[PDB]
Amino acid sequence: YASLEEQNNDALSPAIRRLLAEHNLDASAIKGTGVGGRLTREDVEKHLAKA
């Protein structure tokens, strides 16, 4: 953390949406099976590579 309320690990980021364009990949081949259609990162993970 870095403050009094600040928590530990964070989460994802806004770019998570434009991330499809950053790599020039269409979600057409991917599927957002999130709890609410919310395209998660566990769906695009099995498509890119390692990190």
Swiss-Prot record:
Chain ranges of the Peripheral subunit-binding (PSBD) domain: 11-48
Superkingdom: Bacteria
Recorded coiled-coil stretches: none
Modified residues (N6-acetyllysine): K46
Function: E2 component of the 2-oxoglutarate dehydrogenase (OGDH) complex which catalyzes the second step in the conversion of 2-oxoglutarate to succinyl-CoA and CO(2).
The protein's assembly and partners: Forms a 24-polypeptide structural core with octahedral symmetry. Part of the 2-oxoglutarate dehydrogenase (OGDH) complex composed of E1 (2-oxoglutarate dehydrogenase), E2 (dihydrolipoamide succinyltransferase) and E3 (dihydrolipoamide dehydrogenase); the complex contains multiple copies of the three enzymatic components (E1, E2 and E3). Interacts with SucA (via N-terminus), the E1 component of OGDH complex.
Recorded family membership: Belongs to the 2-oxoacid dehydrogenase family.
Protein's recorded name: Dihydrolipoyllysine-residue succinyltransferase component of 2-oxoglutarate dehydrogenase complex
Lineage: Bacteria, Pseudomonadati, Pseudomonadota, Gammaproteobacteria, Enterobacterales
Gene that specifies this protein: sucB
Complete-protein stretch covered: 104 to 153 of 405
